């Protein structure tokens, strides 16, 4: 069927047909919606490959051509013989860009076509991975004028020689459990911060300690490496009015770079595919800084602002939230590092949605993730109906390696 | 089947078995989620089973399942249906049914209060004047001089579909909206079409910014009739700020009694098309949506200007700053006038406790995340971090088409 999507603020209705080409399941049923759940063979492979090549050739206006047919046969014979195949550089680039295009939880997809792809399929070791990663970080950071990029390591073979980056993001802060029973640094990384020590790392036991990369190549045991500090761009956070702010001693890194997902293109699985773009202000100011299970800093900021924290209805938490997020943005813009506010980013997404609807017939989107964690309804996406469904190529979740690795 | 739901802030995991009793569809499929879509005359045939299901739930709730009283009621209803094609609920079943439609309302964050609902039985009502009297009594009881009390008034159920009782207003109390020839709107933009119908029907509009609309009431399928709610019965709150003395000069005020009046209440297969209900406001409803939605009063700029915020660029977060103050004001004004209201922090925290309680004593709590999470400060409320399962249980409150689109004028 053909579904319709309405924006309740502008009345604009869009019709969706792209969903009709969905393959994977959503987790929902006619009886129950799981829209808010965080995570709901040669014979198998060729179909997948064919589906992919078909869209690739269609995208380049050579659908059904001899080239298309030839390629389809070549891959067909390759799988039948090698039980797998290799993507052409062209198909690789198209695949990665589209996996981003299809990321229903990503609000910055208007940038999807401008992705620098780094082919690391010739990589064989952890030092090699480190080398490729350092080059990605430097390229993408670009002294503050961030550029989206992804580095693709060798695809899975027999699952016994998988490449993996154990970190969740290339750059994050350490987390240690203290005697107090409290947590020093980032609580979200406590466990990882331990496996780094349990492996050899010498933690400074600080509040913002850039973690070491834990790289795994060809199924081997992961190895540690410290990213040249000169390559980790960091922003000290200050407020454009509260000169006391700085004493909070807060800072964040400029490069968001998801490194634990799995990239699936034409059936092939790339288990190590770190990618990066740039931050939306709220990710740091609202989630990293104010989540109760994270740096949980609202109370401190509240106190220095000297506001009545006696009653929830004074909305001190909300007032502080705003100020903190004003600081994050302020600091990044001041240090000339790329960053986008939730207002501008959501506006962009709406524009992207409209482009996608008319040039592609739709845009899979997960409302639960697209709407910013603060000021939801004053951003346009809140009033925008969205249809969520899975399309390939795609970025998928995968088990944390330390729960699957056989040392 | 069992389903796990987890809170990513506390790691608490709950198990849901309640969903096994969901009959109605959700709009989603194994291939598509319609979770953010706002809205995705029965036969004797499908009526008795609907009745039986309900009566079994009722008798089980009172620990009399399988009793003689239970079996006789089933036989009594079955006969009545075969005989008259419908059936009447006992007062007790009506009350139980009403409370459960609220208890099952997956988009309602105030459900911790479900068991305390005052049900007014208006099934003996035959005319619009009769409806007006019932509604006046409901508004006065509910308002209770500012100490709000949850209530619902239930008018006669649908029979053949040509004799429906309907409250044409979407809420018993709402402000008029007027579109000017220059394209701008005076009052509340959301109520413009309804305001026009009221004028066409004879209402003398005072054409101001906060004019309480007249009730347009339809009884037994007849053409609707106009009634003005006694002003002394309509409690309102002037909006001022704890620190901004100029806020009061924005000329804002809101009514204190929220009362949805356009939903359909379904109990045991029976359809109640006019069932106005009221509780009390969560601050953000007024402060974030009614006041700051671009298509509503939209006061962000004017408030931002007076605060002398940097409006040159969005990254100054002037909108976000103005938003908090306005919401501080709404809460402050209500508490000062001693009119019940709840802020989003307290409301969401209570809902999590209610939800956990429901999972243990009931096996679940259908909830719509998209609606439950507040329109501001989303992630600093516990619900944002809570996984929820949405499904439909009856009894329930359902949407129904606006009456002006279906009514056959006499
Ligand atoms: C350049 C601007 C970019 C912006 C502003 C942006 C913004 C966002 C935001 C705010 C999220 C949610 C993060 C969270 O809540 O954890 C997100 C998620 C995501 N983005 Fe983008 N993104 C950008 C670039 C990228 C790139 C370059 C890719 C892919 C190559 C991408 C793929 C995804 C995926 C797959 C997710 C979901 C990850 C998860 O489930 O944890 N994003 N993005
Ligand atoms: C005790 C006070 C109550 C509070 C604080 C509360 C709060 C809320 C809020 C914030 C909404 C969302 C409104 C919107 O965004 O349009 C809502 C929706 C809802 N509530 Fe409650 N509520 C209360 C009492 C009730 C009562 C008395 C009933 C039923 C007897 C009820 C039934 C529902 C239903 C059916 C919806 C969804 C309405 C729609 O879809 O438009 N609520 N509630
Ligand atoms: N802006 C991005 N955000 C995604 C990564 C940052 C995100 N806020 C985050 O903390 N993700 C966690 C996963 C959150 N559950 C991680 N993978 O370390 N991506 N980007 O490439 O531009
Ligand atoms: N707090 C309540 N809120 C629901 C009613 C107010 C809501 N903010 C509102 O404006 N609802 C619109 C529907 C909004 N789409 C209506 N039916 O007039 N309900 N209550 O019983 O206490
Ligand atoms: C339970 C719920 O799914 C969870 O808290 C989601 C909500 N929306 C989100 N949205 C984004 N962008 N990122 C998140 O981590 C979440 N967490
Ligand atoms: C499109 C989207 O579903 C829509 O704007 C929803 C989102 N969440 C909501 N939540 C509540 N409580 N009330 C609403 O009117 C809405 N509108
Ligand atoms: Zn769904």
From Swiss-Prot, chain B:
Tissue occurrence: Isoform N-NOS-1 is expressed in brain and colorectum. Found in the Auerbach's plexus of the enteric nervous system. Isoform PNNOS is expressed in the penis, urethra, prostate, and skeletal muscle, and coexists with the cerebellar nnos in the pelvic plexus, bladder and liver, and is detectable in the cerebellum.
Ligand binding (L-arginine): 171, 280-281, 285
Tell me the protein's name: Nitric oxide synthase 1
Name the gene behind this protein.
Nos1
Q: How does it assemble?
A: Homodimer. Interacts with DLG4 (via N-terminal tandem pair of PDZ domains); the interaction possibly being prevented by the association between NOS1 and CAPON. Forms a ternary complex with CAPON and RASD1. Forms a ternary complex with CAPON and SYN1. Interacts with ZDHHC23. Interacts with NOSIP; which may impair its synaptic location. Interacts with HTR4. Interacts with SLC6A4. Interacts with VAC14.
Q: Which GO terms describe its cellular component?
A: azurophil granule; calyx of Held; caveola; cell periphery; cytoplasm; cytoskeleton; cytosol; dendrite
Q: Which UniProt keywords apply?
A: Calmodulin-binding, Cell membrane, Cell projection, FAD, Flavoprotein, FMN, Heme, Iron, Membrane, Metal-binding, NADP, Oxidoreductase, Phosphoprotein, Synapse, Ubl conjugation
Residues binding (6R)-L-erythro-5,6,7,8-tetrahydrobiopterin are 36, 370-371, 384
């Amino acid at each position: 069927r053909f579904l319709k999507v309405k924006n309740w603020e502008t009345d604009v209705v869009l019709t969706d047909t792209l969903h009709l080409k969905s393959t994977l399941e959503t987790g929902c049923t006619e009886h129950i919606c799981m829209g808010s759940i965080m995570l709901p063979t040669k014979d198998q492979l060729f179909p997948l490959a064919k589906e992919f090549l078909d869209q690739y050739y269609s995208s380049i206006k050579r659908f059904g051509s001899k080239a298309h047919m030839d390629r389809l046969e070549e891959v067909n014979k390759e799988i039948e013989s090698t039980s797998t195949y290799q993507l052409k550089d062209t198909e690789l680039i198209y695949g990665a860009k589209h996996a981003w295009r299809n990321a229903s939880r990503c609000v910055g997809r208007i940038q999807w076509s401008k992705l620098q792809v780094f082919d690391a399929r010739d990589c064989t070791t952890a030092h090699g991975m480190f080398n490729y990663i350092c080059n990605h970080v430097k390229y993408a950071t670009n002294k503050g004028n961030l550029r989206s990029a992804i580095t693709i390591f060798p695809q899975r073979t027999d699952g016994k020689h998988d490449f993996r980056v154990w970190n969740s993001q290339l750059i994050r802060y350490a987390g240690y459990k203290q005697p107090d029973g409290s947590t020093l640094g980032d609580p979200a990384n406590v466990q990882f911060t331990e496996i780094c020590i349990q492996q050899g790392w010498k933690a400074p036991r600080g509040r913002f300690d850039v973690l070491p990369l834990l790289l795994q190549a060809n199924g081997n045991d992961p190895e540690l490496f410290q990213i040249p500090p000169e390559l980790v761009l960091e922003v000290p956070i200050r407020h454009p009015k509260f000169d006391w702010f700085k004493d909070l001693g807060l800072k964040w890194y400029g490069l968001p770079a998801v490194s634990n997902m799995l990239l699936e293109i034409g059936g092939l699985e790339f288990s190590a595919c770190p990618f990066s773009g740039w931050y939306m202000g709220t990710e740091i100011g609202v989630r990293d800084y104010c989540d109760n299970s994270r740096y949980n800093i609202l109370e401190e900021v509240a106190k220095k602002m000297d506001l009545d924290m006696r009653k929830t209805s004074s909305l001190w938490k909300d007032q502080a939230l705003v100020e903190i997020n004003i600081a994050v943005l302020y600091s990044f813009q001041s240090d000339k590092v790329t960053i986008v506010d939730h207002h501008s980013a959501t506006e962009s997404f709406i524009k992207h949605m409209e482009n996608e609807y008319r040039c592609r017939g739709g845009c899979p989107a997960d409302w639960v993730w697209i709407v910013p964690p603060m000021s939801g309804s004053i951003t346009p996406v809140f009033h925008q109906e969205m249809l969520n469904y899975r399309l390939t190529p795609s970025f998928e979740y995968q088990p944390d390696p330390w729960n699957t690795h056989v040392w």
